[PDB]
Design a binder for this molecule. Structure first.
Ligand SMILES: [Zn+2]
Ligand SMILES: [Zn+2]
Ligand SMILES: [Zn+2]
Ligand SMILES: [Zn+2]
Ligand SMILES: [Zn+2]
Ligand SMILES: [Zn+2]
Ligand SMILES: [Zn+2]
Ligand SMILES: [Zn+2]
Ligand SMILES: [Zn+2]
Ligand SMILES: [Zn+2]
Ligand SMILES: [Zn+2]
Lengths: 267, 266, 266, 268, 268
């Protein structure tokens, strides 16, 4: 959908290349294919590496969200297995854990967490969380308070308390990894130039292809332009994995899966 | 894969016998632009198959950890409570339930017969009532270990060491679920398949000038190696499938069960 | 500074356009086929190199991501288990925060004394800066604070150990950042490939001008822009701790850390 | 084994010369440009394939490394915690060494009887050999020894846990190696992926004569050597536990760790 | 290096080709550049992949050595933090930790450690350390005897004893990874291929260049051979990161940094 526009332009520069062609020698222009085949292969190589980097940002982001689900399930498991009777702490903690993940989606989508927070917590908490530098980080400190007082209440050994504390550390690592990938994107520094280069190549290519491909120029030029531009825009979607493009991650579904898992695990 | 090679032999034969008419419109196909495109395709094909490959390997890793963490959890119980064979058999049957249930979840098949062969039916009923049955099998197993802990037969220190093995099985379950629902992005294989198939049909048309009657044998050779490589990526999706090059999840589940049993004198 | 070299190449082309006609008396012939073998090879090497430069920048960010993660969870641990002991909260947070600023000045080679005096008594600042490894001594002192809690019976040996592991993480960060700063990417990779990228871009028109006559500036400028752009991209990524817009925003990261740790302790 | 295919390349090259005459007698032609597009595609796929093979080799290399690391530090812990318990030192050490040799035999699909019988008493050798997974049973036996030191009260639960971790590392090695052996990720495609390289290297002189009429054999086999080296080297690394020139020296590694452990308990 | 030698011979093959192009028609050799473009690009792809592997193993070697400093630092931190009064064991452990790094240097450089060992430790210990097949291993065992005796004097708990024991496990992983990088290089086929082919390709190339370019052949055939040989010889450096070459890790300075960190941390 994004590239259909500029594919048709390339058909036009192709028609312009075909109409302008017989005049090359009157206009003084000689444009052979060998120099463009060298330039095109070097962009291919560079598009290959940039796409590899983008995808691996995607794969990392997906992996970090996988750990929210893994580590919330097993903190709840350890609670049910060591303090089975305290359904009261069960429910408090699960709300923090469910809050943490919706809070994190908003942080990364850069949207308002007030609604989701009120749906799950008391409004005194909702405002303690909204007041923080980082709500997600505030939610974790709160979830740790819940576990801390069970230790001070003697319901946990220092060993079974260390076991659950380690799961909140796993979520701290998820939080940091998501902020690194969010706020430190792939260097934009050249993404502007990284893309300027690929379309400049696609319009000039028919002008250099016609001499060989007299009337087939618009076909082979559009085929070539398709592949180069598809790869470059996938590279740019996948490179903001928390974005809202169609190939980005489905953070809403993932927060829902997370909610259903913990609620099913406590009630 | 074998069908589209023949359409290529046809295209090349069409190109051969329609070659007379090439300058009628001034349509002319050079090899040069097609070798630029064929090289930009080989690169992207190379990178994609890389991701398909890494995805398949991760799934084999995950399943390998099942065997490892289950072997080592049963090892600890045998080494620490060599007397308590009742707990031995209980914990082994949950650990074997987990693999089978994970397999059935990944293949979206019913785990009921397997679960009943291993567990008492009250336990099966608790598991299948869950919207996440394999995750609940872990809660049960964690319970067996915990009452060994609450009955004083394990110290907090080794209880914690066994709980950690359960956390490893939890990472397998998550990673399988994440892989199952997170394919390599479809946009990748969409444009690879559009681009690879178009390029193979057009190719004999551009080879016919250079190779007069030789195009069918060289154009077919070129398209076989691109389609071989492209279809390798498709052999490495669905690692949890049932196909011949999909993982042998059943045989791996039998190995798991075979190990834990010979480990407890059965 | 890269744009400068573009215009030199435009000149190399117009000189090569006018240098061209006399080529007879010296007998110099330059086809473009050999130059496409060399430009391809350079592009392969430049792509592999940029990959290494990007992976080094990424590891820099991960390192800094870990101080923020490790300092947050150490302070959360303190407030979760000793929520009364705010006299140790303030001392440790001040140590954690000074570790970050000291780490930053260390990587940027600037006087840290302002930040240290702003966060610690002049007794401390005199002591830390007397050491040859100031960031290492801050970790040592932060280790004392937890250790004194360990002897004061306020922490078990277990949770004393758990907080020790967070200082360990910060020890690995200090080491990793030091290792990135002292061990630059093998310089053989930067200027020897900078020279061959440079030589290649100027010598390119003199080999193009045969096939392209007055297009040569237009096409040679395009190619050179491509190579010099990608090569300059690897320039930036590969000194991640530098002071430059594209480089890591260390001052912001340290302010976020300080605001987070204080926000966790009012 | 590959020098045979190189010589067929000089042969094919002589056919190309003495029959090129009659090629256009039919109107059949072979330029270089199509075979240069195809050879570059193959070279790209060879790089990626060799990248995957190599990373299989490095991982098998890291897992064997961990065997030596974990056996050394477990024996170190045993010596440092229980300096007096030499009978226990000796029993565990022979299990550790039995584990390594039995892992080598398991990966190479050879018989471990002689190494087991040199190191352990026959009641345990028949028990180990009876088992479904002998290396796994050796780990279980090593674990019983550490278990009875705990039940006898000679170890804290903590320091008993520090050594039990050492056994878990060896269990991860065992599983990683099992997966790197019976799980070539793709199979009978390497048959395709290398048959492709074989046919390209035979058709190459037919496509080279026109440009370079009798020089083809020297150029045709230079190129063939290049392509077939990279391919066979990929297949060597693909199977790191094999007996090839570029595969793992498991024997040197099993001998190093035996030598380390005897030197570590005062048997050298 | 030895590279500049090989650049000058390319000036000879070119002038040879310049002055022997005369006889090409008479000798019946035709050498289009096109087939050499296909070989060159192939080799460039393989060289690109290989350099990556070389660079990776170099980066890993620097990483391993970086952990020596981290693990030794924090071990000394834990000792002061946990048993601040025991400056006597502080000094013995640190001399072991210092001997470990110097011995690790000698082991990787394959040089005698006796001098550095004599400088740092009593004579009975130097003899014991030099007897072992792996002195770095024996040094870790000795440092661990120190920690162990502090545990059986009741001066450490089982937990804080564990906290410090982990640091020695870390050091063992360092030893193991370094030993692994030192004994397991990139498979030598990777280079013999890339050494024979890159060299052979670099000299046959002007012979193909002369017909297309006649007297420019030297200038351009040299540019190409510099690019390939730079990239390939640089790979060879990065593959022996523990080598005594100029571009290899500066192991002596890292052992000096390590010795000075550890002395600064302990009063001196
Ligand atoms: Zn986890
Ligand atoms: Zn509950
Ligand atoms: Zn494990
Ligand atoms: Zn039993
Ligand atoms: Zn952490
Ligand atoms: Zn406070
Ligand atoms: Zn270890
Ligand atoms: Zn002994
Ligand atoms: Zn460490
Ligand atoms: Zn001291
Ligand atoms: Zn001439």
């Amino acid at each position: 959908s994004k590239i259909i526009f500029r594919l048709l332009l390339n058909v036009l520069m192709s028609i312009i290349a075909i109409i302008s062609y017989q005049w090359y020698e009157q206009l003084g222009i000689h444009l052979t294919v060998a120099p463009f085949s060298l330039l095109g292969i070097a962009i291919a190589i560079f598009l290959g590496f940039r796409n590899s980097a983008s995808y691996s940002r995607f794969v990392e982001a997906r992996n970090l969200w996988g750990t929210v689900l893994i580590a919330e399930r097993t903190l709840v498991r350890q609670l049910r297995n060591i303090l089975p009777a305290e359904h009261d702490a069960h429910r408090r903690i699960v709300s923090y854990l469910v809050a943490f993940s919706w809070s994190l989606k908003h942080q990364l989508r850069k949207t308002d967490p007030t609604a989701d927070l009120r749906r799950l917590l008391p409004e005194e908490r909702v405002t303690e969380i909204l007041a923080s530098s980082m709500p997600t980080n505030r939610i974790l400190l709160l979830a740790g308070n819940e576990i801390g007082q069970l230790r001070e209440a003697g319901k946990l050994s220092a060993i079974t308390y260390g076991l659950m504390d380690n799961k909140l550390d796993e979520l701290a690592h998820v939080l940091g990894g998501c902020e690194r990938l969010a706020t430190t994107p792939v260097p934009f520094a050249y993404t502007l130039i990284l893309q300027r280069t690929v379309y400049l190549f696609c319009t000039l290519l028919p002008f250099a292809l016609v001499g060989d491909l007299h009337y087939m120029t618009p076909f082979v030029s559009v085929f070539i332009s398709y592949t180069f531009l598809s790869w470059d825009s996938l590279a740019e979607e996948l490179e903001d994995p928390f974005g809202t493009a169609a190939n980005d991650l489905p953070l809403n579904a993932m927060c829902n899966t997370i909610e259903r898992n913990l609620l099913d695990m406590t009630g």
